[PDB]
Structures are given as structure tokens and as C-alpha cells.
Amino acid sequence: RHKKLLF
Amino acid sequence: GPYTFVQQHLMIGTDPRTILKDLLPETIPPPELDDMTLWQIVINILSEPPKRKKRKDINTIEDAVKLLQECKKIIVLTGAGVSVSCGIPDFRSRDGIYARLAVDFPDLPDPQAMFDIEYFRKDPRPFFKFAKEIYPGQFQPSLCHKFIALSDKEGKLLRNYTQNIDTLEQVAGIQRIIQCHGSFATASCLICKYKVDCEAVRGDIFNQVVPRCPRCPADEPLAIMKPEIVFFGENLPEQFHRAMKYDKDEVDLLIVIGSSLKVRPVALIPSSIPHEVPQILINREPLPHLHFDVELLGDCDVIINELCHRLGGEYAKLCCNGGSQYLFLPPNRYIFHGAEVYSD
Ligand SMILES: NC(=O)c1ccc[n+]([C@@H]2C[C@H](COP(=O)(O)OP(=O)(O)OC[C@H]3O[C@@H](n4cnc5c(N)ncnc54)[C@H](O)[C@@H]3O)[C@@H](O)[C@H]2O)c1
Ligand SMILES: C[C@H]1CN(C)c2ccc(-c3cccc(C(F)(F)F)c3)nc2N1C(=O)Nc1cccc(-c2cnco2)c1
Ligand SMILES: [Zn+2]
């Protein structure tokens, strides 16, 4: 799933 | 998979250079490279996802005003830069809030830790110090906000995806908005899920008192009222995924304003739409990890101001009032006032 992540 | 492909070749004793001779038809790899290193090169090449490339036929700011005129269904992706002129500091820029938080919060490692649920449970004070400074009800929206608002009123705005939680687009009049990271609209107890509106916790927030649940036992320490701000690790709202599903095949123009695009899945939006759709960047710094068609670099207000004057009509009625100073770097990059890449 597309979870809020710092990339 | 590419990975499996290489595995099978390793079981056979295949020379990687044999595969690389036609996978890199014009390039021979330097003599002093490991075999496995070469195989990793093979994996990366084969598993490289199809990317959008810059359109060669779209470059200039004149091209940009052309697109703004003829396009309906525009997606505008905004970030914190769009609100710094309103009086709301950045994360990326010089003298953010973190410089002042690290002063008396030695445990706070990065700005992103304010939106870390584990750190929050440990000590929610840095978050609520941030909340008081950025809390809705105290700031006037910028020229950009007004610009996006006018686009929506004209029926040209497909949607404005914002990473901002300042809720300034409500003030500006931007109705076709998605708040990708939530807002301060409600607040909920971590423990019992007792929900409450923004007002109920506002008093405590401006008094630097951590808003606590009035229903949970008073001795329970984690009974804190947390605003519906999406934290890292958590899911984005249902609206985001629902809107992107419809919008990805409807958009004919993407503008990115005031964002470093370092946070997923919002940062994937330029990668998620059709490759032919034109992409404009309006930002203080360039973003080399993406392929924008036109790069307008500087304070987004002075750039938008310039764009509006060129557009005339209702758009020119917005801006502060000739052109604006810029350094043009062919084919597609413009350096306006305020452009900067900060480091030390
Ligand atoms: N107002 C807000 O909602 C707000 C404020 C501060 C931090 N944040 C967090 C920041 C983070 C989202 O990343 P992002 O939105 O990219 O913030 P960011 O700090 O990572 O990036 C801001 C980008 O905008 C650029 N910029 C700054 N000022 C201007 C300007 N005046 N004109 C044009 N460009 C400018 C800046 O160079 C940078 O590339 C989320 O975690 C937010 O919660 C949000
Ligand atoms: C293993 C990674 C990091 N390591 C292992 C590397 C170490 C060295 C090199 C490299 C250095 C000099 C020349 C070359 C060359 F590819 F032979 F030209 C490769 N490349 C890579 N790597 C590459 O991925 N190189 C590479 C080289 C050429 C193309 C690609 C690529 C990746 N996706 C599309 O193309 C990737
Ligand atoms: Zn509770």
C-alpha cells in the first residue's frame, strides 16, 4: 500500500 | 523478473559481458569491475521502469502561458513553499521551525519526527509547538492560492493536491481541493477514539497545554487528542486514492508549486500520469529526480505574478499591479528572484 513515507 | 533472469545465468556460468554487449550496445564496462557488479548492472537495466521523459517541444515561459490558456482540467500540486509568504516557515529552507525546536528539544532528530507516531506518544510537545505556529484561523492566503482559486472558479482546475495542513485553500476559495496529509479539522483521543472538532482543542494548544482526553482515566498518559494529521506510516485519506483514480486519465497539465517532492505517495503523482501530459515546475529549487518540461525557478509568488500579468483578464486583476528579471538557461530553465538551493 502507498503509506505516507519519507523517500 | 530480471532478478530471476540473472540467477539462472549464474547457475550456468554465463559471462555478464555477453548480456551487457547488447544490453549496452554502444558501451563497454571498465576492465576492473567485479562479475557480480556487472550482473547488478544487468538487473538495474532490465528492471528500470518506463519513465516520462521531458517533452522536447515544450520549453519556454511563453509555452507555459500557452498551456495555461488552452488547458482545462489542470492538476496543481502544492507544498509548503506556497505558504511561506503567508508567514508559515518551511522545512527545507533556512531557519525553519526545527532550528528553534532543537534548542530545547534535544531528542528531536528531524522535522519529520514531529509526525512520527512513536515520538508523539513519547513526547507530543514538539508537535503541538508546531501546531500553534501553523494552526488555522490566523493567516491570509498568498497570490498563488488566489491564482489556484481563480483557476477553479474558471472551471479549469481539475484538482489541487496539497501536502499542506494550514488549510489556507479553504480561505482562498479553492473548492476542488485534496488535503493529502489531513488537517486540524478534528482531533481524536489515541486511546478511546473520542472525536472532537478543531475548536475544542485550540484553547489548550495556544496555552501550550497538551490537549488531553476528558473521558479516559486521568492517569492514562497516552490519552492525547491528536488532530487528523496523517503521520508517517499511516494511510492517506480515502479521497486521495479515489481522486487520483479518476484524475490520472483526465489531466492535461500538471503544475508543481513550492514542493521538494520528497514525500510519497504524493511525490509519485508526476510519475503516475500519462507521459505526454506537460509538466511545469514553479519552485525555489530544481528537482533533478524528476523530468519537468518547463522549469520556473524562484519565489512562486513573483513567478505566478509574472504569469498572471501575461494572462491578462481576471488573472491580471490579482497580481501586485513590464516583465520580471530572470536568468534564462536554455532550453527550459528560468532563474527568478528568490531562487536558491540551501546548504552549509
Ligand atoms: N504549511 C504547511 O502545510 C507546512 C509547513 C511546514 C512544513 N510542512 C511539511 C513539509 C512536508 C511536505 O514537503 P514539502 O511541502 O515539499 O515541504 P519542503 O520543506 O520539503 O519543501 C518546500 C519546497 O518549496 C520551495 N520553496 C520555499 N519557498 C518557496 C517560495 N517562496 N516559492 C517557491 N518555492 C519555495 C523550497 O525550496 C522547497 O523545495 C510535510 O511533512 C508537511 O507537513 C507543511
Ligand atoms: C550496480 C550499480 C551500482 N554499481 C553496482 C555500479 C558500479 C559501476 C557501474 C558502472 C561504472 C562505470 C561504467 C559503467 C558502465 F555501465 F559500464 F558504463 C557502469 N555501474 C553500477 N551500477 C549500475 O547500475 N550501473 C548502470 C550502468 C549503466 C546503466 C544503468 C542503468 C540502470 N537503469 C538503466 O540503466 C546502470
Ligand atoms: Zn480517550
Residue numbers in the entry:
A (entry chain B): 1 to 7
B (entry chain A): 183 to 503, 638 to 660
Show the paper's wording.
Sirtuins generally catalyze the deacylation of modified lysine residues in protein substrates coupled with the breakdown of NAD+ into nicotinamide (NAM) and 2'-O-acyl-ADP-ribose. To address this, we developed an engineered hSIRT1 (mini-hSIRT1) that is biochemically equivalent to the full-length enzyme with respect to basal catalytic activity and activation by STACs. Mini-hSIRT1 comprises a catalytic domain that assumes a Rossmann-fold large lobe and a zinc-binding small lobe common to all sirtuins, an N-terminal three-helical bundle encompassing the SBD and a C-terminal β-hairpin CTR peptide18.
